[PDB]
Copies of this chain bind each other. A is one copy, B any other.
Amino acid sequence: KVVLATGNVGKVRELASLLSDFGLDIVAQTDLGVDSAEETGLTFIENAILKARHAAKVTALPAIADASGLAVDVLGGAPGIYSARYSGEDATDQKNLQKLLETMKDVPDDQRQARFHCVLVYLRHAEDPTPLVCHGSWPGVITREPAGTGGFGYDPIFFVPSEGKTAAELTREEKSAISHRGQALKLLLDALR
């Protein structure tokens, strides 16, 4: 039994069944009454550990967490670890991507490079001194208009060159095969076996 230490349904959709396929019994932290951890970390790695640790503390189960975000080159890597609250704590996925959009409206078509980052952590117990920490990243280009209805977050404005479409235009299987998250997950599963 392993707790999935996220409240993000888009993350759950991209993780839970692949983890199950692998052979784990996955429980969403909300089912177990785990509230949101304080994300006080300055890096994806530290925040992923904090969220996994918070869930492992509450439940006494091993935990997997995901800290991820979008880094845009012209913005010096923003919104980065502040991706979820980019437009404030009114923030929704649509409000965040539209702010990003508005922010980049005068950025030339050839300067819109970006990269998604993902750190996945597996903690055997809350105080595991050697958690499995796996990361992935995924380069793309920020579009000027959203396209596609799949995925979540900034997916409609993230053009994926290798696919010739945005992340939201991919099927879930396609996106799982190549994303920052799918790359990290492959490394995590390798490490687990």
Residues of B within 8 A of A158 (CB): none
Q: How far is the CA of A139 from the CA of B158 in the complex (A)?
A: 44
Nearest Cβ in chain B — how far from A132, in angstroms?
A: 10
Instruction: Name the contact of A129 in the complex, choosing from B43, B128, B133 (C-beta under 8 A).
Output: B43
Looking at A44-52, A88-96, A148-156, the stretch in contact with chain B turns out to be A44-52
Q: How many copies does the complex hold?
A: 2
Nearest Cβ in chain B — how far from A68, in angstroms?
A: 11
Is A64's CB within 8 Å of the partner chain B?
no
Q: How far is the CA of A129 from the CA of B69 in the complex (A)?
A: 10
The chain B residue with its CB closest to the CB of A47 is B129
Say what secondary structure dominates the interface of chain A: mixed
How many A residues, CB 8 Å from partner?
A: 21
Proximity bits, A122-133, B CB within 8 Å = 1, else 0: 000011111101
Is A10's CB within 8 Å of the partner chain B?
no
Is A80's CB within 8 Å of the partner chain B?
yes
Q: How far is the CA of A49 from the CA of B128 in the complex (A)?
A: 17
Closest 3 pairs between A and B when the two form their complex, measured CB to CB: A81-B129, A80-B129, A43-B129
